[PDB]
């Protein structure tokens, strides 16, 4: 059967028995920068399997009235070992990513998730002509949470699920590489993003590459007696990462 999938990277392994199908990107597999498109001149550091491995983010609890979560991935992987350190000592960096989102339930549960990778998700502010603080955009490994009604916290992102922060219809977000975690039949939110930017290498702290979003369209709903605590765990692995421009320790 094709419901079984094993993913091996570095020294970590994820096995799923109720997978559906692994999505890979816009058709492109991640690969190192060729020397016909390169700009920087010194020798890049393709480190080892020391960074190309799975890192586990924190878990969020999916309740009956939860709305959505998001992360910022060149910034969310800032303290995960040698990826975080090679981020903090280099000026340029470049990497693809393999995101594996877990969530499980029983056969008596119902509910549906949407897992999108949105490149260049430029968030909008809550009050209109006002600056946004860096903590309200990206909180490291900690997820920021959408709301149902419009929000008006000062220096905060406008966080309504029916606009997804950017200002589009949320039913139109299926144009990006995505899957669905239907609790009837899925656990395989696997999305192999290639590197997507308009420069061949870029800074990790100053630029956010993309944004993972987990938006439940058909809400979690269960009968009385089932397990009410259903966690969601996001696991992410960088792929084909390389670094360039070594200098002293960066901006924490």
């Amino acid at each position: 059967s094709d419901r079984v999938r094993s993913i091996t990277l570095g020294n970590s392994t994820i096995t799923t028995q109720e997978s559906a199908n692994v999505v890979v990107g816009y058709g492109v597999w991640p690969d190192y920068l060729s020397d016909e498109e390169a700009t920087a001149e010194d020798q890049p550091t393709q480190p080892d399997v020391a960074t190309c491995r799975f890192y586990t983010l924190d878990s969020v609890s999916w309740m009956k009235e939860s709305q959505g979560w998001w992360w910022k991935f060149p910034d969310a992987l800032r303290d995960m070992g040698l990826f975080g350190q090679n981020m903090q000592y280099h000026y340029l960096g470049r990497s693809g990513y393999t995101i594996h989102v877990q969530c499980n339930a029983s056969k008596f549960h119902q509910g549906c998730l949407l897992v999108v990778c949105v490149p260049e998700a430029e968030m909008g502010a809550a009050n209109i002509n006002e600056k946004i603080n860096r903590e309200h955009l990206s909180n490291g490994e900690v997820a920021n949470t959408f709301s149902g009604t419009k929000s008006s916290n000062t220096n905060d992102v406008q966080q309504a699920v029916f606009n997804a922060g950017m200002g589009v219809a949320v039913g139109n977000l299926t144009i990006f590489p995505h899957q669905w975690i239907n609790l009837r039949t899925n656990n395989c939110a696997t999305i192999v993003m290639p590197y997507i930017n308009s420069v061949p290498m870029d800074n990790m702290f100053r630029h956010y590459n993309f944004t993972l979003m987990i938006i439940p369209f058909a809400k979690l709903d269960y009968a009385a007696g089932s397990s009410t605590y259903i966690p969601i765990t996001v696991t992410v692995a960088p792929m084909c990462a390389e670094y360039n421009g070594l200098r002293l320790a960066g901006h924490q």
Partner: protein, 59 residues
Amino acid sequence: SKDIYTDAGFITCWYQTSIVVPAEVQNQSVILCFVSACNDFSVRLLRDSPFVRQTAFYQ
């Protein structure tokens, strides 16, 4: 045996999401753990076991 020059590491297990069950199904379940050796496992120095203990002859 236990010496500090050949410490070997740790095995831990962590909840990744949760256990999710439907209604009228028992929540509290049981995981069983096995152990074995691979095809490259090897032992070297014969000694007596520290568990055998005898005080008088068995008659």
